[PDB]
Symmetry: D2
Subunit: 380 residues, 4 copies
């Protein structure tokens, strides 16, 4: 029925055999066959299928309202598998500010295999239509994006993709299936870095993919089996376990996000704040139309590198580390940690200023997170 119930009872996460109320961890590579070709429960080799992996695959399919789930050894392994649906000479349209690892994979790996990519500003969906070439096969969209949280209209992207025969893909990592369901809006394939919110505890690197399309699912299964970027059973188990509390975690994070944004907007040492909940944010109305909650990632401007570093030193409850979606609140400086490759003038042009801070809101008490960040900002 409701979302918090579906998180607990959706998917197959018990043992039919013993009745165990959690998925057994099948730390195994192969399976007895009673006769040649007769598989007791359909398992024959863990790369092809593993019962613990099958459990987390059924969870993500259920939560995204798809039919088929796939678990990969990382988010970028999921992305790489989806890109390998295409051939040399095929073309992909992506949003201009995709995740750095996605940008790296596409422009430094798959470009050597002859896949062509263009990065366009998808906040206006007619820019997608202009970029469509005769060779375009795929539209790949993150929303909201990192680190400036640009929003793309998912449903219009799906219609454009359908009209032009494109496979549509949404990287739904930042919103999670608790708040945004791209398959319900016509998207062909949805994927996640489960390393972030889904696992939720900073202790699994994993990617998840769901689709309702039988033929796309069969092609993904073939690629997964052939290139072998499969999630292991122990990580599959920890993913299933972490997903149980996804709703509670996301709701705590959202309460804190609202209060933190009020504080940031009021504070004199903060300039621009980037988050889709802000009413003046581009495509705010579009985000509310396609999601019923918010990501915990917020970016905001302080004055310069020195203020950003002192902010980090002065906070007691914001932890300096890579990644997002932890139970701890995380803090980082994109210009130094994710975009330090880009020359400074182009960084500034894109809005990645020296004093741009990104926080990933965790599940600490709301008042503590607000008060801690405010008192640290007061030291500026």
């Amino acid at each position: 029925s409701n979302k918090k119930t579906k998180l607990i009872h959706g998917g197959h996460t018990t043992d039919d055999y013993t009745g165990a109320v959690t998925t057994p961890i099948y730390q195994t590579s192969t399976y007895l066959q009673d006769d040649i070709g007769d598989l007791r429960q359909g398992y024959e080799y863990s790369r092809t299928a593993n019962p613990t992996r099958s459990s987390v695959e059924s969870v993500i399919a259920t939560l995204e309202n798809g039919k088929h789930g796939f678990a990969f050894s990382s988010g970028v392994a999921a992305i790489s598998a989806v890109v390998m649906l295409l051939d040399k000479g095929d073309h992909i349209i992506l949003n201009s500010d995709v995740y750095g690892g996605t940008y790296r994979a596409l422009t430094k790996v798959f470009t050597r295999f002859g896949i062509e990519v263009d990065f366009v500003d998808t906040t206006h969906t007619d820019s997608i239509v202009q970029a469509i070439r005769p060779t375009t096969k795929m539209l790949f969209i993150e929303t909201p994006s990192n680190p400036l949280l640009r929003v793309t209209d998912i449903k219009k992207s799906a219609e454009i993709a359908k009209e032009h025969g494109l496979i549509s893909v949404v990287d739904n990592t930042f919103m999670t299936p608790y708040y945004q369901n791209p398959l319900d809006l016509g998207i062909d394939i949805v994927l996640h870095s489960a390393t972030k919110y889904l696992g939720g505890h900073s202790d699994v690197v994993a990617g998840l993919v769901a689709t309702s399309d039988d033929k796309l699912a069969e092609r993904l299964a073939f690629i997964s089996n052939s290139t072998g970027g499969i999630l292991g059973p122990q990580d599959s188990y920890l993913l299933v376990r972490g997903i149980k509390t996804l709703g509670l975690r996301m709701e705590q994070i959202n309460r804190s996000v609202i209060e933190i944004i009020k504080m940031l907007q009021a504070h004199p040492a903060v300039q621009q704040v980037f988050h889709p909940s802000i009413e003046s944010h581009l495509n705010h109305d579009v985000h509310m139309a396609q999601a019923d909650g918010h990501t915990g990632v917020i970016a905001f401007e302080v004055k310069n590198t020195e203020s950003a570093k002192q902010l980090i030193k002065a906070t007691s409850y914001y932890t300096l580390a890579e990644s997002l979606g932890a139970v701890e609140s995380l803090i980082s400086v994109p210009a130094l940690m994710t975009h330090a490759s880009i020359p400074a003038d182009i960084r500034a042009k894109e809005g990645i200023t020296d004093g741009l801070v990104r926080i990933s809101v965790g599940i600490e008490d709301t008042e503590d997170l607000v008060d801690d960040l405010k008192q640290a900002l007061d030291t500026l």
Copy 2:
């Protein structure tokens, strides 16, 4: 010093911090930074590097006498990473009877990305020289191969590759580093399905890669980080644990292999036996020159499908399952399980007869394995 000592004390498999005599399992995705960019021990994000994965990587590099190790989510993920060293338009020479998963990946995935492949009979190394095209970049060799155990001269392959500027790769799964060290013979890259002998216990799917080449290592690290087919920490730990007993297991397997082959050659219901220890086997002398032991995989002919199936039913200690390198002895019928896709007439032409049986010798008592298989053959 000697091999069994190096298995125990080679690589870094203790905890410098606590002194723990086994590698801690870092079930973690990210790492505190004391200041922006300052990593306490060089770790920042588990996809890029994880201390448990680093441990198994240092073991495989040590055991193969290389400098750099890489752990992937499966054997075929390791193979896929190595193939991705090449670009569209590049050409690969492989032995004609490569592992089915390798054949599938190359001819159904990477061919769509414009990598060109030819499968040639490398048992004569001048067939490699004939196949070399202006676009050839890589020579990929398994030895001995599956399921007929064809042997390829590793050292001459390495010289040919050096002379023509080719990256040379050996799939060393069947022999393990305990018996065959391709990097010592001039090969650029050695790889393994650690799913088999290295893990040794049928409970991890994993691939391992080693090289001494700094620049190839840097390219593999970039591909691993970008396409994300990384082995998880729990599987990395179980791999390190299984490798400790590799020498004892391989030596038990070899004692049984010798006795089983004597029995098979003497038995009237057995026709041809395929194994590199047989003196009339093609390139027997070459195998002894490049290895100091034997794989546990043996193939042999019985009369037909019915005899093969009754053999399986009559054995008490041979287990019908996919994979090899278990502690249990495994039995299978290639024509029904690995080559059933190939039309029957071409199967017979290649020597994959209906009555071709493959066994993977385990670590059960030698006399039991010999006696069990003999009494089952007597029922034919």
Copy 3:
């Protein structure tokens, strides 16, 4: 600062060495010594101390505002260790309705070792004073109790224990440290079946003990080391992980508990409801004075065995299984599952009627849990 923050940042649950943001899993039994007797970080043998176990021990000590934590292989192993603080001839006072496993251990194991026990109704604390013998050494109190949720005044129990030289112990399983802190009220020792709420995911059997008393801690450490009921590192890790979401889970459970109790009190097929939040419940005022929330365990009466069984069959979201504190809502019938040993007439006398149902409220959506249980009650 506030409770939800302390759950995330309290205790030592990172790796000082690598910076890993989660506790490494030390699957290890022993530790290198640089010289005889010099331990790098104080570890020498995992039974005596293990760094992953040390992490969960520091969490429970922090959450209960104690100084010393201890992790055992189960709740009853923790209880057994605490009982072994006493000698033959010593006497224990416990509440009359202690957990069945505690009753079993005391009256069928430790009674054979000459420990004497009396079970008294501690809802009136003067009954403790009357039961105190010259040989009494320990007062052991659960509050609230199972399955009728009787409440005992913790602070008065602590004063009585101090006045008469008794070691005071509270089994704080049902309330968790999120809502009730016995050490802050003068109790000597607090313990938990971490199998329930603390782990929270039905996937660890474990006991935890905390104290502020240096000398009691030293005696518990000696008993733990000597009788060896230690929690393993993998379970220790999963406990630390589950505790992160304890606050969010308990708060969801409490919202559902309030609404479910309203429904139960209004429903015509329900007679008596047992829960400390009900204002007419014995020692309701005492519970509010010593706790700032509620357990998720509720008991209530339907008509008979048949109604209880049909209730179970008609619910979609209440799961029939043993244990409590899961993310799933659990349902059971004490007279058939925990008290079937007791003759029926004595069952009825104690209030364990045939139609007494116990539910453990999980973290499903509140409206679903209320509506599901109501519609099932309507079928009666």
Copy 4:
């Protein structure tokens, strides 16, 4: 049939449900019941029984030729459970040099519960007969003992126990079931610290118990369920995995033991050597009558503390750490590490001289272990 085959195929270590060739890890606390009291496969609560624990229990029962197995959180938890078969006023006879942890448990824990113990020299079995009191209920024997490897006649001990109505117990840790089977010689109960050889990889703390006696098994099951010192599922799994290679490891260790003892006896810086394989060792003939191999623990005398410490510093392949039965060879000095509590004069009287060295032989190459220890002895 033969021992190495029984190690692989004995016990139930596959999944009947999926066919998985390894035991699934049931990281779970509780189990769905289809109706009240109807258990799908007999499981209801993991403390009472867990399917992964059940697997390792069936292995130890099979390997010791018993009927019932029990897995505890440590060796001393197994010992404590067996001691709790007795009541206050009952008396136990143990060998005079039992393991220090066993001595500690008995004389500092269970003595407070009124169990009486006498430690006698069981190398002459008539000393057992003399020590038998009217209150004696149990005979507890280690053979061979630590650190001087005294041998006790198991079969005569069993007959004495039967004649006088005693429960007989053998701590079979040092020999393992691969070489010595006390239940076959009439002993009632056999137990192990699986922390040592059985796990074999220094990464599990665990105890195992086997018996053929239905009534003793029922009493052990009740004590295990009631005091809760149960082994967890992950450790149970690693135990099952480690036991697979027990035969190969023990045989490698035995080859090295023979050669090392030759070297030690010939070396001028070595005085007495203690090991049951030495023909002049007390009860050498008795050991050969009840075992078909040897423990890897050897003790030998050098001159003094300084020589012992320099020996440790000069070895490359002997590791200074607590415990035994690792894949690594371990070295220690009892007078400083296990018997430093005992005054020096009594240490010397018992034979625990300052220069007494204990080694636990691992699975490194035999020639390396011999040569390394010899060259280090030459520096004396």
